[PDB]
Design a protein around this ligand. Structure first.
Ligand code: HEM
Ligand code: HEM
Lengths: 380, 380
């Protein structure tokens, strides 16, 4: 027979029809990835939760030489840092984050209002707003955000084969972090401040900058893409923005539901089976690639009635947008706060927010870890 | 039978196979445009030259209500201005243009060199370099170039139906031109300077700003897109950049050949037949839409041997990249100068210039008047 191909579709404004058929017909299915390797695509909520919470399936080992891949690695080839890192990802270790984020959002939003519609809400909000957040998370200035976000454009490319340029891109920004950490007025504030300190107590510079880089990349790309999907929802269903205006306190339940809904994840969560395991009806052999399809789990009608309709008042919403098990997103609280504040500012300041053209004419980015529109032109 | 669909393909790095079949099989062919109207696609050099030089085929009338369209108009609904305009499009009416352009190019190029590869040559060069040129052409500052280029992103969308937002976008930047022309230190220098003067001699503000807007839009979009295609050629055939380095004076013949080669034109030149005309073997009835396919003419082997191989030493190269007949590009000299200077700077400063990833993985913009890569990541 012919294997279904993976990934599924770049169009991000409706669930891929193929993700619905996979969950219904073959919740665990063999698929051919874009590298040509084969893999197991897990697309039901129960089975997807099982894999994520079972450490016999390993994320660490998906980067070993020789294993099957869904796309080439872009990164080339245990020390009490957890604290430096975990302290930075507690929105409760920076009391001022909330109000500072609100001021950044309104700053960007006010700039667009003076210029008048239309505006591209990716380059005007979401991109600078996600760079600014992560520049502050590290304690480095927002001056270079365009250059840092552009580095993300390359770092998160999904390519069938390794490509020159992902290595050059890695070492180029790695040098940038090194430079900020070793600047003369040694950095205070942020992970880079906690890092300059940690290297006086009684870990290398390369490895420090590595953690700074992957945290900036992983976060700016993920918050910006989700936030563009949230915007598309509010622009298309304006009754949702009315709800937010009338009942501002629902913003927590609403971001939670948009998280379940959103299709910003353009690949699958990868795991390498460390042992033979039985999963649903399929026998998975050690060394094989397993791919968790978050959108299949989060649209599974066994767990989420009317999964295709956004609903802020679900009795229960135990979605997998942040992963699960051991590798559950460490910054989940930070990601919620970031989106809650941005959307609250958006629906106050642009109350007639809508798309400037039919949603079907948005240009969706090919070949990227996230599904995102290249531009997000809106009116208000 | 089923009509071939138009436009042809967004991928811009090789000739669309369908454009070769149309020229060989049906040089004049009925096609269904993206609006659903039908039209005559003229794809041979002789026939395409005929249409362009025959004023019974009318560009003016392609904007009349009711006529067939290849895409909706984005603009909504004879006065001695020709001089103000023609004086601005003579690279010989600004002695300083050459050296100023060279300084802008090297400025942008030096900025990329200090940051190190990879760089996106669309956002780093071509876009700011084409905005700067056209900001100077009008005598307005380069401060807002990002906002002006973003307006181009919407103004030149090809949509099956009119969309809100193209009108708002038009009036929004129309106001910008009006504001620069009616600024307190009334503008000197450029079309806006020649305009503030022309309205003291013994034409309305709306109409003045209209000419400023369409000239900025038509030029920034066309020079930026061609220049990205020229870059892709030099990066892929590095023997061409060696030729330019060794024999700098060939830059005129080389831009001329890249012009013949380039696929930045994503639509066809539209004409409304004012009369019945016989064209090749086809009888065209008055009121019908005729579409000239520049890439078919410029790859026609009847006129250009080995049309698919870039060649700087063709005996003759009478291409149609700039149109022809009455509506031949008024700024053709300006467009050549602009590209010649940019490419000369590019191959001096980035001598190992190449694409950062396989050319087949470039993201090509959908639904736009130009074929262009969304990003152009390179190494050197
Ligand atoms: C709305 C925003 C975000 C969404 C939807 C999201 C989603 C996810 C998901 C699904 C995972 C699990 C991946 C797996 O199991 O393989 C993950 C992992 C991760 N999250 Fe992203 N994320 C967001 C924001 C952030 C932010 C703000 C940061 C950092 C600044 C961050 C840092 C990380 C890191 C480092 C991991 C890897 C954890 C590990 O290796 O165990 N996330 N997140
Ligand atoms: C490499 C750059 C350029 C290329 C390849 C190019 C190409 C063309 C073509 C093919 C036409 C004819 C369209 C038709 O017959 O319907 C045209 C028209 C036109 N060119 Fe663009 N162009 C370039 C640069 C520029 C620049 C720099 C400006 C202005 C700043 C400009 C202004 C115009 C205008 C106003 C028209 C319309 C003329 C009319 O209505 O008769 N061009 N050009």
């Amino acid at each position: 027979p012919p294997l279904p191909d993976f990934p599924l579709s770049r169009r991000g404004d409706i669930l891929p029809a193929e993700a619905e058929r996979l969950r219904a017909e073959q919740p665990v299915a063999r698929v051919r990835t874009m590298t040509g390797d084969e893999a197991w695509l897990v697309s039901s909520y129960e089975l997807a939760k099982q894999v994520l919470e079972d450490d016999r399936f390993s994320l660490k080992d998906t980067a070993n030489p020789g294993v099957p891949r869904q796309y080439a690695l872009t990164i080339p080839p245990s020390a009490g840092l957890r604290n430096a890192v975990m302290k930075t990802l507690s929105p409760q270790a920076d009391r001022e984050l909330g109000g500072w984020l609100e001021a950044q959002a309104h700053q960007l939003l006010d700039r667009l209002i003076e210029q008048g519609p239309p505006a591209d809400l990716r380059d005007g909000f979401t991109e600078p707003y996600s760079a600014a957040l992560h520049c502050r998370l590290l304690g480095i200035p927002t001056d270079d955000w365009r250059r840092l976000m552009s580095g993300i454009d390359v770092a998160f490319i999904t390519s069938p084969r390794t490509f020159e340029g992902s290595a050059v891109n890695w070492y180029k920004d790695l040098g940038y972090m090194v430079d900020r950490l070793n600047a003369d007025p040694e950095p205070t504030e942020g992970l880079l401040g906690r890092f300059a300190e940690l290297r006086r107590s009684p870990v290398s510079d390369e490895l420090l900058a590595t953690v700074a880089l992957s945290l900036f990349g992983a976060g700016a790309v993920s918050t910006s893409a989700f936030l563009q999907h949230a915007i598309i929802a509010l622009a298309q269903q304006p009754e949702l923005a009315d709800r937010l205006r009338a009942e501002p306190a629902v913003i927590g339940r609403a971001v939670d539901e948009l998280l379940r809904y959103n299709l910003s994840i353009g690949d699958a969560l990868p795991r390498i089976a460390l042992a033979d395991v039985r999963l649903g009806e399929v026998e998975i052999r050690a060394g094989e690639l397993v791919l968790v399809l978050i959108e299949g789990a989060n649209y599974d009608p066994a767990v989420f009635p009317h999964p295709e309709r956004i609903d802020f008042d679900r009795e229960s919403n135990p979605h997998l947008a942040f992963g699960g098990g051991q590798h559950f997103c460490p910054a989940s609280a930070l990601g919620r706060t970031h989106a809650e504040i941005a959307l609250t500012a958006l629906v106050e300041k642009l109350p007639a927010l809508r798309l400037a053209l039919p949603v079907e004419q948005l240009a969706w980015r090919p070949g990227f870890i996230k599904r995102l529109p290249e531009r997000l032109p809106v009116l208000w």
